């Protein structure tokens, strides 16, 4: 990883999604923040806690064939520079999609529940649990 190069790229990506999801002729509603929050937490859960294995052979005799990207990364270190950044950032989005959604009671169940599906696999008291 490039510690400024990877992180930065991730930041860019999110933004891109927001501007690709925003400015839509059909729906010009400020409820794109919920959409943003909705796509991103389901996008993180697939590529970090669902897809199992490596994307290329010859790592170490398939040592991590039954491992997830958030388990194998950083040689299992609990709190590395990156482990914290990928958990502080999904909750900062939750502050941004609440200043604009006016604390909707209808979107509260569609935002938090999407927040708990990501934050709970990131707990260090779980690991190998499938």
């Amino acid at each position: 990883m490039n510690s400024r190069g990877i992180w930065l790229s991730y930041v860019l990506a999110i933004g891109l999604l927001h501007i690709v999801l925003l400015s839509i002729p059909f729906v010009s509603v400020p409820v794109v923040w919920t959409l943003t929050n909705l796509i991103h937490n389901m996008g993180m859960y697939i590529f970090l806690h669902t897809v199992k294995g490596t994307p290329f052979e010859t790592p170490d005799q398939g040592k991590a064939r039954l491992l997830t990207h958030w388990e194998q990364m950083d040689y299992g270190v609990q709190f590395t520079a990156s482990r914290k950044f990928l958990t502080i950032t999904p909750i900062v989005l939750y502050f941004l999609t609440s200043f604009y959604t006016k604390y909707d009671q209808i979107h509260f169940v569609l935002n938090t529940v999407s927040l708990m599906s990501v934050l709970i696999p990131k707990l260090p008291q779980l690991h190998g649990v499938r």
């Binding site: 914290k84 609440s98 604390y103």
Partner: peptide
């Protein structure tokens, strides 16, 4: 002006801090 959001929100802010120092 959150109905029940602030109570949940308070836990999150604290959660970041004790996670940040490790």
């Amino acid at each position: 002006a959150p109905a029940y959001h602030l109570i949940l929100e308070g836990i999150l802010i604290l959660w970041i801090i004790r996670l940040l120092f490790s």
